[PDB]
Amino acid sequence: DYLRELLKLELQGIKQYREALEYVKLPVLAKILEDEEKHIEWLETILG
Amino acid sequence: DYLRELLKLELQGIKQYREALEYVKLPVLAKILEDEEKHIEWLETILG
Ligand SMILES: [Mn+2]
Ligand SMILES: [Mn+2]
Ligand SMILES: [Mn+2]
Ligand SMILES: [Mn+2]
């Protein structure tokens, strides 16, 4: 469940990054988003 | 302010990753943590 909580936070996090990127085209935000996508993939993997 | 809100989420998230690493020494969690610290420094930088 602790991993599920980290995942849930990561999922909430990306929605916020994506909303900013709807309005401002800042590459640093797309860069962070890219890492968050990987964070999410690793958590899903270790959760099975 | 939207950047301050992303920074807040990142700071709340880093605390959850740090607590799990107190207990389970999973390199994948430390890999995420190292990225999050960079996310935070990037937000601090662009906020000035
Ligand atoms: Mn909003
Ligand atoms: Mn993350
Ligand atoms: Mn706890
Ligand atoms: Mn992050």
What chain B holds in terms of domains, given with CATH numbers, is: 1-48 (1.20.5.420)
Experimental technique, in short, is X-ray
CA distances from A19 to A23, A29, B27, B38 (A): 7, 10, 31, 21
Resolution in A: 1.9
Alpha-helical segments (H) within chain B: 2-23, 27-46
Contact list in B for residue A42 (CB cut-off 8 A) is 28, 31-32
The verdict on a CB contact (< 8 Å) between B16 and A32 is no
CB B32 within 8 A of CB A42: yes
Cα separation, B7 vs B12, in Å, equals: 9
User: CA B40, B33, A35 angle in degrees (round to 5)?
Assistant: 70
